[PDB]
Amino acid sequence: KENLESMV
Amino acid sequence: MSYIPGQPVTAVVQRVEIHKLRQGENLILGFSIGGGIDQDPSQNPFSEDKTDKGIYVTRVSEGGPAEIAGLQIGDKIMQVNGWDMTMVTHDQARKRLTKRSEEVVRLLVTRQSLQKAVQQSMLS
Numbered sequence: 001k002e003n004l005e006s007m008v
Numbered sequence: 009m010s011y012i013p014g015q016p017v018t019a020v021v022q023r024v025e026i027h028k029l030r031q032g033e034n035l036i037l038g039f040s041i042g043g044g045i046d047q048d049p050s051q052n053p054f055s056e057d058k059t060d061k062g063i064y065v066t067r068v069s070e071g072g073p074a075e076i077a078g079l080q081i082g083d084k085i086m087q088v089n090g091w092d093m094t095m096v097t098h099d100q101a102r103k104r105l106t107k108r109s110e111e112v113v114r115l116l117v118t119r120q121s122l123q124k125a126v127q128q129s130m131l132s
Contacts, residue, residue: 001044001047001048001049001050001051001052001055001056001061001062002044002047002048002049002050002051002052003044003045003046003047003048004043004044004098005040005041005042005043005044005045005066006040006041006043006098006102007037007038007039007040007041007067008028008036008037008038008039008041008102008105008106
C-alpha cells in the first residue's frame with residue numbers, strides 16, 4: 001500500500 | 009463538437025502493450041512507476057480509496073518502449089497482461105512486469121488525455 005516506486 | 013478543453017475525461021481506459029527492451033541479458037523498459045508515490049501503509053485498511061493502491065506512472069524512458077506503446081508521464085496502471093494490479097502487491101506486480109514469460113506487458117491504464125507536453129502542475 002505504502003510509498004514504494006520502481007523503474008522497470 | 010469533438011474535443012472540449014476544460015472538461016475532465018476522468019479516466020481513459022486504454023490498453024497498451026509495453027515491451028521490455030534490450031540491454032544485453034536484460035530486457036527492460038527503463039521507465040518508472042509509483043505505487044506508493046503519495047501514500048503510506050496506513051491507508052490499506054481502506055486500500056487508499058478502495059481498491060486504489062495508488063499505482064501511477066511518474067516517468068518514462070522517453071523515445072523508448074512504454075511511450076511508443078502508448079504510455080506517457082502520469083498514467084494510472086490498473087493491470088498488466090490482464091492481471092489487475094489492484095488486488096495484487098507491488099512485488100507481485102514487479103514479477104509479472106519483468107519476468108521471462110512475456111516480452112511485453114499489456115496494460116490496462118487510465119489516461120487523462122493530457123499526454124506529454126511538459127505541463128508543470130504541482131500541488132502538494
